Each structure stands twice: as structure tokens, then as C-alpha cells.
Amino acid sequence: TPAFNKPKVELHVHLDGAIKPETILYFGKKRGIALPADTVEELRNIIGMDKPLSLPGFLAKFDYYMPVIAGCREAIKRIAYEFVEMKAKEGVVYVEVRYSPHLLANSKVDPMPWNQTEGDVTPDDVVDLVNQGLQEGEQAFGIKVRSILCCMRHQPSWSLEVLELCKKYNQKTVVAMDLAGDETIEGSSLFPGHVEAYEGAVKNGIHRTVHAGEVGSPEVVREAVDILKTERVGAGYHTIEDEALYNRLLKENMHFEVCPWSSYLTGAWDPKTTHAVVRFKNDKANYSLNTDDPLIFKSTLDTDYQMTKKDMGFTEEEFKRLNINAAKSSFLPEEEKKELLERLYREYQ
Ligand SMILES: OC[C@H]1O[C@@H](N2CNc3c(O)ncnc32)[C@H](O)[C@@H]1O
Ligand SMILES: [Zn+2]
């Protein structure tokens, strides 16, 4: 019994965070790379989390499985393909999947991710592979899907190349650039590589999103918006701690990519306080409801919908509104953007 059984738009989900345990298991065995378990069930208890941790503590779960996926072309394309399929089943009509192309390469990257052995899967090759998987999926489960390439807070030396990958693959699935990773890393928002990568996104008209205010302070959000020029804030819950900042983002109609379940499990949100999306709903803010890393959170898009419904008083009207705003806030070009809005209004009749 779904909380909102109608078309949805998802703007914040990590491809490397939305993989099938069965596919992880499949590639570990197939490539002979070890996993912390040999059963999807136990594999799910290891990778998965059911209790709040920290952002740094949540980010480590990727260590368990990324090594069986990274560097494998067959695996990179497959997870992309299975991703559309999963979203299609969730009643998502449009989705932007994000991921770091560097963390899945085994060539032309430095530091080599996961102590991998050099190979031929270059970062560009990864983008190409995901596009192919994503394309085959759209054209098979019939949902529209775009991708977003992530700069990693810890590795700014990779940022300018991410930008280049966005330029080269512009709308050839890639619609934007993100800044993901450990938001606790003091000053990561200000590292030259990142800063310079965004400055170029602005001059070359490459869309921009940035995780900020998930666990960091208002100043992290302020810098994402003012220095990095984000068009959207991933999470952004901590903005409400700076009344002035919030009101001004509210005025600019800043879009907040909200992930309810994820915020509890990463400690982004203290469960003894009211969720910031409650205030967002009440101030009629521009915001989407997203899944983030469903593999690790052992969830689905309905988990976040059921949570807001059951615990935060969300009605179908708010569900409709947030998704129309998500559509408007997407990085789809005008024509397609309108086509999306048209479908929502049609189906929302
Ligand atoms: O998907 C690209 C990377 O972004 C990082 N992620 C995933 N989830 C996530 C969270 O919302 N907050 C910050 N960074 C995150 C992970 O390290 C993942 O490998
Ligand atoms: Zn995220």
C-alpha cells in the first residue's frame, strides 16, 4: 500500500549506492574479489545499516562492494541498466542518477581507487558505460533518465576532469556536476580544484548541484550557493539554522534535494528535533523527496514517502506539489522539461 502511488521525479540518488546485492554477489564470485559475506542476506546486513552512524561512518560501507564493481565494464553497464529498471518499478517517470566516474575506473586515475590493479577502464570509459546502460534501460522500461557526475570533496585533483566529462557528455545523459563525499572535511568546499571546476561550470553553462548542510553548518550551504553557484543544494537541512540564510534561499526559490530516511541513518538529522523538511513543507519551499543510497539504507522511494506521510504529515497534495517542483527544478533542457511537467499534470488529473 504505497504512500504515493503516482508518477514521481527523483533528483538525488547515487548509482553506486543503489546496486542489487545479487549483482554485487555475482561480480565478487565472477571476478574472484572478496565480499564481507556470500549471501545477499548477510551481504545486506554488512553493507546495510539500520542505525544512525555518521557521514564518515556511512561512507565506508562502499569499501565492501565497490571493489567488485570498479574496473569491470560488464558490471558498470549492468548496474546502470538495473537502476532504470528499479526506478521504473518505483513509479519514477524521470530520474537523475549521480556517481563518481573516478571511483569506478581502474585506469588513468590517481590515487587508484580500491587498490586496484591498473586496467583499461578510464574515467571517460565509465561515463560512456553508464550512458549505455542508462539508455538501454530507458528504452526498455520506458522512463526518462539523466546522470550527474560527482566531484569528491577529498579529491579536488579530479574535479576539473569531471567538468570536462560533463561538457563532453552534455545531455548525452550527463546533465550536471555534483560535489559529494565527506562534508566534514574542513574547507573541502573551498579547495581550488572544486572552486575552479564550478567556476567553469558557470562559464560553460554546465548545471550545478552540491551536497551541503547534510551534516555541515550554514556556512557550508552559503559557500555552495555563493561561491560554487549551485542551482540546487543536496540535503540542505542545516540551512534553517541560519534564519537569514534560509529566508534568502527561500526567496531565491533554491531547490533542496531532501532524502528523509538517509538523513536519519547518517545523523544528518537528530531524531529528537523536527525534520527540516517539515519546515520546508510549511514554508512551501522548493524541494524534492529522494532516496540517496537505497542499497546501504535498505530502502525504496516509498520508504521516504511513508516516512514523511506517517511521521511528518504529508498529504497527496504536498506529494504532487513537491514533484511538480522537482520537475521544474530538473536539469532537463526546456522542451523536455515541459514534456515532463505535461505528463505529471496529465497523470495528476
Ligand atoms: O556516488 C558518488 C559518491 O558520493 C558519495 N555519497 C553517496 N551518498 C552520499 C551522501 O548523500 N552524502 C554525501 N556523499 C554521498 C559516496 O562516496 C559515493 O561513492
Ligand atoms: Zn547524496
For this structure, what is the CATH homologous superfamily? Metal-dependent hydrolases
CA-CA gap between termini: 20 Å
Shape: globular
CATH topology value: TIM Barrel
CATH architecture: Alpha-Beta Barrel
Q: Hey, roughly how much beta strand do the residues contain?
A: 5-15%
Structural class: alpha/beta
SS element count, helices: 16
| CATH class (first level) name | Alpha Beta
Gyration radius, in Å? 19 Å
List the strand order in the largest sheet. 1-2-3-4-5-6-7-8
Count of all domains: 1
User: What bound compounds does this protein have?
Assistant: 6-hydroxy-7,8-dihydro purine nucleoside, zinc ion
Largest beta-sheet characterization: 8 strands, parallel
- Fraction of residues in helices? 40-55%
Helix and strand succession? EHHHHHEHEHEHEHEHEHHEHHHH
The tally of strands reads 8
Binding site for Zn(2+): 12, 14, 211, 292
Subunit structure: Interacts with DPP4 (via extracellular domain). Interacts with PLG (via Kringle 4 domain); the interaction stimulates PLG activation when in complex with DPP4.
Site (Important for interaction with adenosine receptors and increasing their affinity for agonists): 55, 59
Active site: 214
